[PDB]
Amino acid sequence: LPILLDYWPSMFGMRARVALREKGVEFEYREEDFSNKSPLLLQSNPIHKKIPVLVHNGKPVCESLNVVQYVDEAWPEKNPFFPSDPYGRAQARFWADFVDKKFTDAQFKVWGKKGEEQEAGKKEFIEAVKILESELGDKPYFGGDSFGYVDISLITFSSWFQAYEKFGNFSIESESPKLIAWAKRCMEKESVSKSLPDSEKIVAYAAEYRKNNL
Amino acid sequence: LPILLDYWPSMFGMRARVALREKGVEFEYREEDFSNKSPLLLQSNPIHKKIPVLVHNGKPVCESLNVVQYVDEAWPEKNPFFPSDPYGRAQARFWADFVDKKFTDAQFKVWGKKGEEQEAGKKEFIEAVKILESELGDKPYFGGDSFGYVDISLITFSSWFQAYEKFGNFSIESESPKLIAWAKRCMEKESVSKSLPDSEKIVAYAAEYRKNNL
Numbered sequence: 001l002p003i004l005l006d007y008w009p010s011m012f013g014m015r016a017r018v019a020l021r022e023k024g025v026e027f028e029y030r031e032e033d034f035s036n037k038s039p040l041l042l043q044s045n046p047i048h049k050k051i052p053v054l055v056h057n058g059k060p061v062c063e064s065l066n067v068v069q070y071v072d073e074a075w076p077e078k079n080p081f082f083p084s085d086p087y088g089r090a091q092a093r094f095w096a097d098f099v100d101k102k103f104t105d106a107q108f109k110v111w112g113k114k115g116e117e118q119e120a121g122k123k124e125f126i127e128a129v130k131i132l133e134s135e136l137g138d139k140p141y142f143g144g145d146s147f148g149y150v151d152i153s154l155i156t157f158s159s160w161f162q163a164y165e166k167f168g169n170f171s172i173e174s175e176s177p178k179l180i181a182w183a184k185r186c187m188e189k190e191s192v193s194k195s196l197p198d199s200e201k202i203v204a205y206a207a208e209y210r211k212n213n214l
Numbered sequence: 215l216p217i218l219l220d221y222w223p224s225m226f227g228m229r230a231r232v233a234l235r236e237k238g239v240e241f242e243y244r245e246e247d248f249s250n251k252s253p254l255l256l257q258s259n260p261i262h263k264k265i266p267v268l269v270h271n272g273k274p275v276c277e278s279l280n281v282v283q284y285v286d287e288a289w290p291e292k293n294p295f296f297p298s299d300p301y302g303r304a305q306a307r308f309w310a311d312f313v314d315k316k317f318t319d320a321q322f323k324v325w326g327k328k329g330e331e332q333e334a335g336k337k338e339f340i341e342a343v344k345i346l347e348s349e350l351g352d353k354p355y356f357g358g359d360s361f362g363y364v365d366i367s368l369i370t371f372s373s374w375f376q377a378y379e380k381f382g383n384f385s386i387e388s389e390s391p392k393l394i395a396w397a398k399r400c401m402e403k404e405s406v407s408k409s410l411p412d413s414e415k416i417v418a419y420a421a422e423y424r425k426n427n428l
């Protein structure tokens with residue numbers, strides 16, 4: 001089977017878990033110890049030494065959105081992640097990029113920082129969530145009538161929402177109610193619920209990080 | 215025609231110029247004033263307000279690699295930017311991402327910083343250029359036998375090489391001779407030479423930046 005090198009609380013690795021399950025692709029999950037990275041990880045991703053890595057037919061695919069796109073292309077005959085047209089595909093790439101940049105940067109400040117930087121992060125997080133709310137609009141998914149690439153890129157972060165709300169001491173639903181409705185909607189899918197760890201475990205993880213580093 | 219909103223010394227906008235010319239696509243170039251951004255730019259890219267933006271059949275495409283991919287998909291019948299197989303496409307995406315991250319970060323430190331940060335940037339730049347040298351190997355292009363996506367992603371920075379060498383006071387050819395041979399090889403293409411400004415103009419631009427900010 002394809003081998004997925006991963007780390008359980010990673011919102012990035014989770015994207016690969018969701019992608020593979022949404023395709024119905026069977027895979028072997030391997031938990032990496034960053035203090036003791038496997039020979040296969042170091043051989044497969046020598047530049048970044050990061051997860052996720054998908055090893056498929058002897059070839060490594062690195063970077064989580066790259067892996068998601070690879071899964072779409074390697075198993076293209078069912079559950080397409082993208083619309084068929086160039087513009088819709090560019091839209092999907094744009095919004096996943098926005099998640100990888102602005103949203104990712106803001107959320108890390110919320111659970112990973114304290115003081116003024118955390119407060120700044122919380123403001124930036126709320127701005128990002130309002131922008132995403134506006135893009136979703138009244139559609140069931142970012143991909144429209146069907147769950148697709150942008151949904152995969154963002155839904156993994158919903159496992160961290162409890163942690164965001166705890167250390168940011170706020171309610172995401174108050175800021176972006178349709179986004180929260182969307183997260184709940186996606187959680188009805190086995191591809192999502194089986195891929196995302198319990199949010200209480202993520203809280204414990206974030207709590208430990210703050211204890212050790214702040 | 216498709217409208218390209220751009221800024222002449224931008225290594226990112228240049229990617230769109232190169233992509234369109236490599237496809238033989240006629241376009242209208244518009245020079246944006248960042249102090250006075252056009253209504254079309256603000257309407258087209260309200261989130262980032264950055265160039266390049268390609269406006270095509272009434273629809274805006276934002277982010278330079280996104281634009282390059284869009285050009286490949288919208289004009290797919292000739293000069294393909296990617297190999298046909300999923301793995302080769304994932305490789306191409308990975309390496310363009312490496313250029314957008316590690317290389318882009320390092321080069322900015324070389325021309326945009328002074329002191330220890332510039333010295334760090336110069337070390338990181340040389341590391342990046344050696345990594346890219348290794349990936350290119352003895353192939354004529356990053357895309358292999360033909361100029362492709364990764365070549366487009368990186369070749370625009372060669373217009374900045376003179377500036378890197380000036381403010382970093384060093385020789386890129388000493389560190390990565392095959393990479394320099396590759397840059398010269400690409401400059402033989404009209405799609406590249408017509409898209410890249412004279413490196414002496416870029417030097418003047420960088421010099422002005424350092425005068426005003428360091």
Ligand SMILES: N[C@@H](CCC(=O)N[C@@H](CS)C(=O)NCC(=O)O)C(=O)O
Binds near residue numbers: 010012013
């Ligand atoms: N841009 C990467 C980010 C992946 C990433 O940051 N992975 C983290 C875990 S969440 C990692 O592997 N860290 C390895 C380390 O700490 O050395 C992607 O989207 O795959």
Ligand SMILES: N[C@@H](CCC(=O)N[C@@H](CS)C(=O)NCC(=O)O)C(=O)O
Binds near residue numbers: 224264265
């Ligand atoms: N990630 C973007 C970067 C583009 C970018 O940074 N563009 C700069 C010019 S090089 C810009 O538009 N700056 C606008 C501003 O300074 O407000 C891409 O690849 O398109």
